[PDB]
From Swiss-Prot, chains B, F, G:
This is Thiamine thiazole synthase. The keyword Metal-binding applies. Its cofactor is Fe cation. It is found in: Cytoplasm; Nucleus. Induction: Repressed by thiamine, but not by thiazole. Induced by various stress conditions, including heat, cold or osmotic shock. The modification 2,3-didehydroalanine (Cys) is found at residue 182. Binds 1 Fe cation per subunit. Its main location: cytoplasm. The keyword Cytoplasm applies. It holds the Pfam family Thi4. Keywords: Cytoplasm, Iron, Metal-binding, NAD, Nucleus, Thiamine biosynthesis, Transferase. It catalyses: [ADP-thiazole synthase]-L-cysteine + glycine + NAD(+) = [ADP-thiazole synthase]-dehydroalanine + ADP-5-ethyl-4-methylthiazole-2-carboxylate + nicotinamide + 3 H2O + 2 H(+). One of its GO terms (cellular component) is cytosol. It comes from Neurospora crassa (strain ATCC 24698 / 74-OR23-1A / CBS 708.71 / DSM 1257 / FGSC 987).
Length: 291, 292, 291, 291, 291, 292, 292
């Protein structure tokens, strides 16, 4: 049941006996700003940046921060609420289906499921996302800059190497026409993991920018749905696309022209894992090239 | 560190040695549709409904499902992503400030914080919401119907009315009752309905605004100015059954009561939800008897 | 005249003597969800999927389900209301004009008309569409999923073969930016009939998808209006375009680069009959390939 | 099975042997215009106008044209497709629930159903709608002006009497700003049956217009959902609200402050039957005054 | 001064002595539809069609109807108000400037002006347009179908020959999404004069359509503003682009890749004069081929 | 047949022989700006202002300028193309129906028609509008400020007020008073304003609605149902000075008066403008005196 | 301290002892139109035109009018408010960072800063823009046509072309060539045109995008990733006459050269402006001749 303290408080609610401690509005403001600037300052030069906090990005943020408490992890998520397209299953339904061996990841992060043999099923996709999300955030080396969009990549010569991200408020990135000029800010980082999902108004950002930066010819383009070949491809091909830039999740399907998997998350999760692994493998090198 | 099983799997990713088990698409479909219908069939008739998965509603769901595992709790949230305004702090910033004694609740749900004196600060608003959400979604007596909007209330006579459930529909359908032909809603019968849809706005403050148009209220006193000290006490202390079968809490309450807003501080949303759950339990049997 | 039971009921309406049997909301909600998820389950794996419930789609569904009571036909229509663009004639006018021998089909589905010589005229385009819709829906093996949009195609290797469709609620398909990620659902099928009208926000989906999937050179494009050359072209060329994918109706004009016919439905109707014949010709084989 | 004629034509589809009879585009334009304007001419002055071709209106239309084949019935429907909100059940599902004795009506029009006791269930709302639609449109005295909106009512003194409708193309009604002035057209009629659903951008037209013309104190507005009291109310209180104006269906709930029922069409059917009945009762009187 | 009849009526206004003759709404309705049907029926098959009632098209309509009373001239104008960009000069100002010898045309149509030497200035652009428009509309052989758009062209083999235009209500052409399918209407003609202004949403229709029909490599595109080199170009090159299709006005600039003149209308007027000539030159031959 | 000069020019078109006289863009620019700003200067202070170049406003302007060549007439029309809803008949059809004795006016403005006994029919609404528009613009004492919107009224005391001019701006600016930073309007002082802006709507019934928001009117009775027979009479017969310096006519009148609507018929609009012009003249001297 | 005249006036405010001098609306209207025409008439044919009043354009305008009081400078700014993206720093913040020697330019226009070694910081970007802006507008040979958009260019031959002016229109009109009937643009003839319209977007990078649509450029390399060190030197040292009559600078140049972007750092903009003004002088006599 409930904790004794909370049980002792409840009877108090709705009576003169209950009242919150005194507060001045400036206190709250400063409590927030002082802390946000701290983060903003400390992450202007970070170790690893993760663009897009969906099922894949979060799964990467988890593995990475657990194996490397020594590294600073800056997650830049466009929406106010993180989680990408993992709050639902298919056609607005709830059940999250993960084909084995993705269950190995569900165990790791402590997310229950029904075993069906070749695949497992999480009660609600929300349960998976909220749980993983909750744990990632507990990590002292992780910072979630939600409500923030990546408008461009910080580049360098040698062919180019990605060395950071150009950020701004998601709402600003969306109205660069509905106001006067609003310049973005930056984040210097040796390694960037992009998991912004597939092509769309917001998705497939890093992969599409490489093309506009005339570094890529074109995008093969996410192909039709074929669960069996899709998940396999996304997970095994998750890697450093260009120096300093690692791609995973469905964004990868855009650059590689892989099939899509529809309402099944095994690949996203393990692709998250693969990406964290890649970041580690490539880190020391890019770190040297960035300093 | 990571678990052995995962540490052993990692080296496999990126090699021909890795492959997911076989799967036929329709197995995925049926896997979801089967379970979803079950929910839809089971919750068509439920015990308690909570409208609005914002910080207040979630806190209510937590306390309620914990205290009454015997009760079926149906959470209906408009957005795909649940959490309301609990994903951020103030002005798009992160820090979640909670005035004491709300820290008692934080301890209850296991959410770390920095003791600052009269108030405490949670590293990130997101840290609180995901934790509570995670714990709530783990109770076997709770179901989250996200991307689902409450378009109306199910009423009963005693011209006074009793709220006996909600009229539902896919949020996307609610937002486009013009861009298409007629799309009727669905229903959920329930003895007690908790409404925590936040304050007035395109989507928010549904129940309260509906009571007015159903001609059960003279109008809404409307949310007033920001005064944290008087706002949080007012909200928490007055969470209650506003009309038979309907309890209001959170910022939706400020609209009918005409209370001040508190802005970027979540103590009241948490304890108001605690009180919302307490009220539900106090009233359940009575409404449950009246409803059947 | 009316039936006696109804004539007997009428005097009742408007009096205390009239009342509906008792009911509980949960009863109705269950009557619906139970039956829907039942279809949803039974059609996850189907025999023939018809994309687009317009004059062509409908015509094909009619002939098909009539000739093969054994096959399960899944009609996936985008709009809430079916009927495509066959509710009107031209420029918001009613009269539906069909050139012979399209009248043989109008005789099949029992739709009255005026014989003007080389063509026949249906009183209102709505008379055809409603009658046909009514008859197709009465078939025990036909299921209509209206408000459901086809977002992609389920593919398989060998060049590719179409093995089904990727589905979602039309209102979701239209707002993949007005919310967080919302994954689609799916339906497996050996043969898919696509009749989604010519290019536009909604139309010519299959053929456009074949291009964006990098399976087609480009769309020849729907050409000018020339009824005589157009109708013969749509009808005589309706066929399996790729293993498992049959295209007819005006969508066909997008890939074949045929002329348009404006306000005349003979071709749409007979293209439907042709599409039906094609599904049958090609069925057993694609079926074997898909199991 | 199919008809021999159609079975004999099918093999021909897809061969040089097949070809549509000669045609010239101007023949198709004239075929439609000549007819559409014949209707415009005959209906400019009609016997009964029914606004909104939804389940309630379509039902009323069915009974009115069958009982009085002598009267000209003019149906004005805003949408391109008629049927209102009777193409689906609730939350986009298909099953149409009808509480008894509404099954007597389903018997009348020939729409099959499963008997569940107090209520019967029609396979798919569309089957009911398309079926009834087909029959109404078959009547020689009925005319469906779809894609046409009622923007106002024609009035006369003695308080006022409703004597017709002000019409226009729906698209014009929706864009009285996106262009220069576009005047409406007219249809004189002694009795007007308004069945345009509950309030919304399109709905509850005549009921709201009475208010704006300062004839009504206001709209009590549709109340909460309560199937048992809503349907009994809507059906029993369908009547002539003002001389010349008979309101039924869900539009009546706005002026009466009646509860809503949701995904159940029992009332819409019988309110329609009763609206038609009231039409007949009041016809001679209004016709005498209108002339 | 006013006319005696009017002067005698005036004092009557605002007194009980003034009243309009008896009317019934249906009378007015029938007065319009009957004449519109007549027009819609007589023009389904016409001699010459002019797309776009702007300064250029209108000039062409004038000259063409005046030199050939025997021919039927069908003007299809998208906007509700005809005139295109000739209701104003540049930057919302009023003065209409025409370089000589354009003044020769102004003399012809009876439009006063100030001579400045190389150019003449018309008091207000509206003056020119209202006068030409008034004279064009007076001709017994001219019909103005405004509020109507040309969505496509009618084609014939032999490369293709333009034999008419696909029409629809402008509002319907702008919302082929915001509703169900709405088929267009047709008009057969041996020669079509397109003067739909330069590129944009509505503009440069026929030229752009020649590309989408794979008849043109691309549009050279309207170039920079060089009044002196542009107007001569527009005028001297106005001619039959494809058999049956004459392009003039600024639309011509799109296909020829010519400079623009901005706020000066000599070219437009003389281009129209030229257009009418081409139609006459080419008429008998096209007429022959089209029948 | 065509003129000889034109007939001699046609053969030239299409040959290297045809060419336009020399020109410098700036010459054209100055040709326009000079004249326009001349208009702005002269009309800033005018005699009579007509807001709304519709069938009623145009008829009023025609009668006014013809009976009073001495007065300066300033027409302010929101649309780029003037003519309001006088380009079409009903439901996008052409024919323009005018009941008698409006035909007396059609003879005045030189517009042909088919006599049907109790009413006459003009070939195309457009014929009427373009013809009248043409004869109005020709008068030397009239200026047409198209693409210009009247956003407010200029007032003076005798609390009762007197309308003494219009507040103006480019229509495009009137519709985007958010889509940019602040954009102040301009002004036109005038002792008499004839407002003929049609019935309520985004653009319509400007003055009548403004009188209300200026708290000089209780509320608009609002345009009523359609009844041609009683509507036209009421519109023509009650056209007049509603308030000192403000004459209202056409369909804007039905909004304040609460009169029926006539739909696809124009007799009343035409004779209303005629009455509007008669009233301006009756009232002019008095208002002018007060205004100076 | 304030001025004595103002100090003596204040006590008057809020008493019957205060009142403005008499006025008649028409007077204010004529005071504005009269002057606007003067400008419109004098600039139709001008010396140097600067498209885009952003930081770069503004800087160019300053340097140019200060070195050539004899030249008439016509600035066309699409927005109501000038200044471009120079009202803020990055992510909506204030501080304007300029890397040296860009500080030389701030000393010239009198804008304070904190020296930080290799760079300096102007309190708020608004200080730089407002100061520069103020100083530029004071110049008697400068004219700011704000709320005005360059829809196209004036071209001449020597298929090589020369730029000889700009096709103009009210910005709001430029944005609605579909929301009305045809609205022709006006013109401005000039020998040299400095285009500084920021980088690609609905309004940005105009001349550059136009050179391509006019079929004078193979394509646009497109602005590349953010790399401040290579970006700023590149934009500044490559600012030049791209085509006879057209000088390009600021961030627009990045579109045509495929140079890196610099983000929230304005050093390059200011010195790119100085460079553009300089190029215009170097090129002026020659183009002036070619234009007459
Ligand atoms: Fe930028
Ligand atoms: Fe509804
Ligand atoms: Fe997706
Ligand atoms: Fe109107
Ligand atoms: Fe079409
Ligand atoms: Fe203002
Ligand atoms: Fe233009």
């Amino acid at each position: 049941g409930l904790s004794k303290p909370l049980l002792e408080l409840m009877p108090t609610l709705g009576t003169d006996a209950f009242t919150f401690s005194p507060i001045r509005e400036s206190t709250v403001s400063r409590a927030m700003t002082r802390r946000y600037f701290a983060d903003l300052d400390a992450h202007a030069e970070t170790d690893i940046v993760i663009v897009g906090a969906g099922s894949c990005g979060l799964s990467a943020a988890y593995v990475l921060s657990t194996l490397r408490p020594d590294l600073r992890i800056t997650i830049v998520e466009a929406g106010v609420a993180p989680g990408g397209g993992a709050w639902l299953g298919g056609q607005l339904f709830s059940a999250m289906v993960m084909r084995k061996p993705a269950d190995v990841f569900l165990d790791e992060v402590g997310v229950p499921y029904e075993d069906e043999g070749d695949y497992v099923v999480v009660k609600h996709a929300a349960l998976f996302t909220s749980t993983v999300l909750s744990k990632v955030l507990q990590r002292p080396n992780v910072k979630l800059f939600n409500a923030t969009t990546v408008e461009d990549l910080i580049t360098r010569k040698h062919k180019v190497r990605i060395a950071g991200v150009v950020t701004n408020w998601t709402l600003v990135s969306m109205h660069h026409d509905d106001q006067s000029s609003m310049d973005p800010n930056t984040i210097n980082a040796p390694v960037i993991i992009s998991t912004t999902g597939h092509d769309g108004p917001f998705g497939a950002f890093s992969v599409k920018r490489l093309v506009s930066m005339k570094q890529m010819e074109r995008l093969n383009g996410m192909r039709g749905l074929d669960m069996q070949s899709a998940e396999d491809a996304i997970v095994n091909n998750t890697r450093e696309i260009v120096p300093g830039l690692i791609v995973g999740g469905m964004e990868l399907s855009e650059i590689d022209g892989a099939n899509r998997m529809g309402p099944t998350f095994g690949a996203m999760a393990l692709s998250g894992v693969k990406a964290a692994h890649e970041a580690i493998r490539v880190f020391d090198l890019r770190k040297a090239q960035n300093d």
